[PDB]
Symmetry: D2
Subunit: 509 residues, 4 copies
């Protein structure tokens, strides 16, 4: 029996969810594709069903979205910002129930569920002001009687593919920025968080409908690999923002590049925390814990590698283990719980696989490493010591709560060890040395898109451009001038004079 | 026998050119790959020889360049700008002999040869000031006692692959920007302009060596497709700047995405001039002429499509016909010449082929279309009417002086025809209508990277970012914030406070 | 009796307004100064009274404001933006009663009273995003192992003196930008719009109070010339944003410059519309009309000079006559009314004085020019022809609905005539000539702070920096990088190396 | 007799200086005012004479510069940059003789004389690139069919009044920026450095004339307070850049404000150095020495106040006195000499008076404090301890090598002590504490325009905006966006649509 049919989950109806929901929106609701059932990862019980998009659904949707763009692009950017502001308020009005759904279908703890929705509300308030600012410089032309200007226009249709772990905010940050930039959007979320994608889409839909705007401006085509690949190969998709694993992201990027389209890739992470001898241990230990076990280690910015100086290595590990024992586990919707279940049953298997490989490669499990004997997809937060820093499994992103601890001696080698992996999302060092801090930020420091000091790998905010380097994709979202990725630059020369070109010996007229 | 061994060409020696020249520079001069002889396209005679890089030479060069980066990247950006300043002066001191070499080996007329070198001089002076400006904003953090900064660092090794038509300035614009940004450069130019590449490298090498800097900061590895492919597949090449055809650029782009590297693609063009009924025809006819026949139609920004409104179609054509008949043909280095040869004999084959396919697709040759009985690779400037705007040969970049003329009635359809091709480099309308001019610059206007008004498609300067959209690659060079393509962005959060994270019910210390 | 005591004006109570109101706020409410009574320009009746600030009130308010700054400047800018966001929402909840108060105490039509409040609401939303963006560039130092950064910090206390014609939004645009930039604010509104100042202050106070912040962050000291003069001389006022007449602003600027303080001046205007022969007359006539008679000619951006090409002059004027006679007059809060009363009785007399002085200078009144025989400060919309462009009364800002119409021949001279006056706020041409348009925007073009094409002199918005040149002050508000005027710049070089200076022959 | 008649100073003729020189340059060279004689501060001997500007000279010059502006303003900004580039070149060619003139007439040592000319050279190279960059943003209008652009135009005539201590570079940095911004310049340098002003003018004059440009673009009218006051009152001076004392600057500022003009004020300084307990003393001692005695303590950024923590107070003071004794004083035009003479005889009097006023204030001279028995205006570098930090002479800018030393205990109070004075030009702290450094840069830190860490108060470069706060004037020169002070902003809304305003119940046509 589906949870949404049980009286205790009647609050799901406040998001407009039913026993069977439509997973396509383009002004109209539909879905002739495969009917998927999503499950609560805390108890493996089925919640509700979503009818995904068929190829024909995708086709019709893309066409409706591009026709809607003809209208949306002619709307002044500040007025597009007004729509985004209204989307912000609309999310506020549903922040608790939507945050509850995120906890229910995805499995993160409630304050992170609500918090993720707040991140979307926050990016909306940000995009409202940015909508009056987007543009380029007026340059002084070297030619008398000419103007030189930099114009920015929408790319057209922005395809948005998102991962499971942040089923609201990742789309949200692409949505808010793309909309003020005059783009229409097409969403294909993770299949396992389909209800969430429908819930958000319903909220946005009403805002567009109340303002007499075509709903295809924020289109939805639920589905899996097939819909996603279609988006990657569709020339009508002017920008494809892909958020997910490196393995899938590599193929999406290659498909987009094949058709000379634009891609925005936000891929995997393997982020390290480095603790030098002069570090504040009262700061290092709790920072490492929450960055490693937060969301059960299912953040792209999760701390997965911990380099500690030889002098303080044993102490920091011992203090970590005593703190790992206090981590409260249970239902994600339980306010006393710090630590929820993994998203899927396969995630649990990957967890055990990495643990076994780590041990085989000489590692030692000083805490955890076992599956919790209880309903749901619960595993113990895990700390592994002894592995060589260049161990294969350590160089591999395992989307699970496993922290590999390494020893080091000097600044030069430990910087290289942070950079020696293929991923390049987030990084952090903990130290008080002024010279070291700036070298860390310099050309011989971290090669990551996020480079932090005395704050763990999860430290980011709206004002800055978010993304990573190398195998992380190189794309950027949110702040700074990240909006430029959602627009096309044109360099324009306007001759307003009555001057004629030099004839060069040629008799004209 | 070689031209360089003749008295009238003794000026070649002033560029340090000999009978056979080493085609590899990395601090040392060498080359053990295939020997190539480059020819003057004006008379099809051998000039001199260059010993190209072997694969082993390339490996050695990359190693030395990356080692040279360790030193170059530690040098303050303004001091890197001082180096670029001296490069500019060195080019100034050799501008006539180098300009002549460009005219001799590539085949553009002398004023454009010198002019191209002048462009490298100008971008150097520009980069000097820019070296003191590159960087990111300090942002206000949402967290108390935290600083949020945006850092920019060199990507490292910048591979530059350039085309034949601008064998100096294309590399030059990439070089000046990359160097102030802290990168080392490895250059592979077009094989048929190898002497020009060696000459430029000698000039830069002397500056680097006079400043006691490792010469591998500006490395050279002359070679063909194999050396290029090696660069495209080399992980040690952080950024690959490719300037060339779309066919080759597509494959280069894919190899780079395959290894999650960075590419900058400046590819083919099929640029259109659109003349409206209200256009000043005394401005249109000369603008169209010079944009079409300039550099024997071998500019990437060459005008290849000419849309004329029905009312003025025949008048513009006749005036172009009478104007074309006055174009002065001769050797590039001859005074007061306007039109030289095509670069290769194969390029002449393409010319004839496109002409044949044109009249087979319904086109009429109203001027030119034939080869000139003269030493070298000389063809007649050509005007073709009657072709449908969607004809296959019209949607193709034929790098020869062929101008396709079309009729249009209204503004909506003619904007679409400019945009319907796969290329998206440059575009121009000639009109006096205020509204139309802004619609042209707007979201419903040209889709090109360069959108001009009352100035032909060749209209571009340093101050702005240069590049195109769609199949042109998306890359940008020179002005605005194009320097960000040669650097990696990091978003950095610095905790300078003594605050500790919330305990969340866990007892630490 | 007072208007606030009559049943039909009971809606005033929704704004916290009483018979007699405190005109001082600094976390606490008070007022031991003189009691002022403001009046309704539509019927010359008293609305309610306000206790203005005494000297002691001013002193304790400044001190409390600078104390509150120690807390406010430590609050991260994005969080300050959140406060400004809540102020925006609080304004939305009172947008109709506040807009009605503006129509009542100031005199503009209801849609503009509401419209002015909406402008404050919009600048708040704008400031929210901007609060995450304010800052300077990290620059590449020429010194190895050195960092070069441009920092921006709040100036501290920002004094805000405002005019009567826009008694809500002018303060609003200053308040929103100043707050995200980390400053505290002291507001001295126009005396004749004291109730509006109190009402707006009550709205902001609750938000600050609900968020457990010191109320002095947005302080209010109602008062006249003496309080304003004090702010101009007070070294504890790090920035004085002044919005008012040129005459007053000049003295304000000199006092602030005397003590090496910072000033932001937004002063008078004498804004011109120029209609060339190639202009769309269907655009020119209604644009000229609304720009000239809007808010009874009481905008700083109001069109006062109209230059028309001699070939279209007579046609334009005639069409303006026919349009002017359809202008609907009445109560500003009454529907379909386009035209309310002047702000004060003094303004009416100044209106008549300019009319007579224009006749004596050789001008001709082709429409209006008289006082309307009705309750309130109502005067007819006026069009004056025949004056020479260099006439004294034309060069003078008369804050009243008077439009001076001139003829011109060439583009060169008419550009000079727009620039020849002392004011330099707004300017507009109506033409289709591509070249002329860019010349208008160029070095030989308009010398004004606002330079418009095919849109009248009142064409402005939030995204742009708002201000004028020459006798208009030179200050800027709202958009672009106008926030820099509310902060101080510092250029910082940071040596993080272990390298020592060159000994230069000396042994250490 | 004059020093320009002794063949030992024959090199003065390389700058085109004669016995009596014209001090007025517009299109022509004139001077009907008083004839001033300038003296070498090292031997109190007359060098040469300069015929200064009469009132008629000033009126003619002003009128001629405004006519020249009509031509100069039509010249594209990048082409104006080319002129500035040539100015930089001409200075390079005369850097040795002009630098020697600075040492002769002003009194600073030769490397600082040549170095000051190099500063002008460098800002010229900086300006060239900037001239392609100046402008405002294109913004999205909230109105359909409307463009919103920010424009920047020259202010017109930029009047420049400069001090004695930097008689080349201060004008230089004003000139380079003002010119590329399209303004003409009127220069009135310090009366005591008249020869330098004329020499600099002659260099620029040759450049302008060789380019067939009206020489009035860089006009010169030598004079004292009378010419300066006329500029401050002149409505035809759209911008007055004043560089000098706070006393004079105040009155200048008031006059310009009286007539609603623009002023850029760069005034007095009273710069402090704060050394905390955790400071590297190997860095502090030489840093404080060179900052205090540099240019005989006649820099506007000279360190005049020195706050040392009580724990390290006695040591640092001793080390300074030990190093102070090693300072090699002599002729400025002589090698290995670190300290030269004061500029005038009146400067020596002010020096002694300040020494006396500090003794009566309870301070103790621990080194120097007396005049040097030798020709010229030579004084001993002085160190004063025991003074109260709020002593009247301590808050006073005495333009002589006098360093007041104060003790402190905690961070909050010593920050206040740096800000407690009227001056706010430059400030420096020396420490390693991460949190302290950021607080120093924060809202509760220094109130100065230059806020340095681990570098003396003389630390400034081209890239950043140079200027101070409070009684220092508020003006900014050189880097960042300081160029906006030389131009006027306009916010331009362009209606390019065919739309008509709402009739509001009125019948039109
Ligand atoms: C002139 O009357 C005037 C100037 C500025 C404003 N603002 C901007 C601060 C409020 C909309 C209103 C009126």
């Amino acid at each position: 029996t589906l949870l949404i049919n049980q009286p205790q989950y009647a609050w799901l109806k406040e998001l407009g969810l039913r026993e069977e929901n439509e997973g396509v929106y383009n002004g109209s609701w539909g879905g002739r594709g495969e009917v998927i059932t999503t499950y609560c990862p805390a108890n493996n019980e089925p919640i509700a069903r979503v009818r995904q998009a068929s190829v024909a659904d995708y086709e019709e949707t893309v066409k409706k979205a591009r026709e809607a763009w003809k209208i949306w692009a002619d709307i002044p950017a500040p007025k597009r910002g007004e729509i985004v502001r209204q989307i912000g308020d609309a999310l506020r009005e549903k922040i608790q129930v939507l945050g509850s759904l995120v906890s229910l279908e995805m499995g993160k703890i409630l304050v992170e569920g609500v918090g993720e929705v707040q991140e979307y509300v926050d990016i909306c308030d940000y995009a409202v002001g940015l909508s009056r600012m987007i543009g380029g410089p007026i340059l002084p032309s070297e030619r008398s009687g000419h103007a030189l200007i930099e114009q920015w226009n929408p790319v057209g249709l922005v395809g948005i593919i998102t991962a499971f772990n942040f089923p609201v905010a990742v789309y949200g940050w692409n949505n808010a920025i793309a909309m003020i930039c005059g783009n229409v959007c097409l969403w294909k979320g993770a299949p396992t968080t389909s209800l969430i994608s429908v819930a958000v889409t319903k909220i946005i839909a009403k805002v567009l409908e109340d303002n007499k705007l075509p709903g295809a401006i924020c289109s939805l085509t639920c589905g899996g690999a097939d819909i996603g690949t279609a988006m990657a190969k569709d020339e009508r998709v002017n920008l494809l923002s892909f958020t997910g694993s490196t393995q899938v992201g590599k193929q999406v990027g290659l498909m987009v590049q094949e058709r000379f389209g634009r891609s925005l890739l936000e891929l995997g992470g393997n982020n390290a925390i480095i603790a030098f001898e002069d570090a504040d241990l009262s700061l290092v230990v709790p920072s490492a814990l929450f960055a490693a076990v937060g969301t059960a280690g299912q953040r792209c910015t999760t701390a997965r590698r911990l380099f500690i100086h030889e002098s303080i290595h044993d102490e920091v590990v011992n203090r970590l283990k005593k703190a790992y024992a206090q981590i409260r586990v249970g239902n994600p919707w339980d306010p006393n719980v710090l630590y929820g279940p993994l998203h899927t049953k396969q995630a649990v298997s990957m967890f055990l696989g990495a643990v076994e490989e780590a041990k085989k490669e000489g590692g030692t499990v000083v805490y955890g490493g076992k599956v919790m004997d209880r309903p749901g997809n619960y595993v113990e937060p895990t700390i592994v010591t002894g592995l060589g820093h260049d161990a294969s499994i350590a160089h591999t992103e395992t989307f699970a709560p496993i922290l590999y601890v390494f020893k080091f001696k000097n600044e030069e080698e430990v910087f290289a060890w942070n950079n020696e992996v293929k991923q390049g999302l987030s990084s952090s060092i903990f130290t008080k040395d002024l010279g070291r801090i700036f070298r860390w930020l310099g050309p011989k420091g971290s090669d990551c898109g996020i480079v932090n000091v005395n704050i763990p790998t999860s430290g980011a905010e709206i004002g800055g451009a978010f993304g990573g380097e190398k195998h992380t994709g190189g794309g950027r979202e949110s702040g700074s001038d990240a909006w430029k990725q959602y627009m096309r630059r044109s360099t324009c020369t306007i001759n307003y004079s009555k001057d004629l070109p030099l004839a060069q010996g040629i008799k004209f007229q």
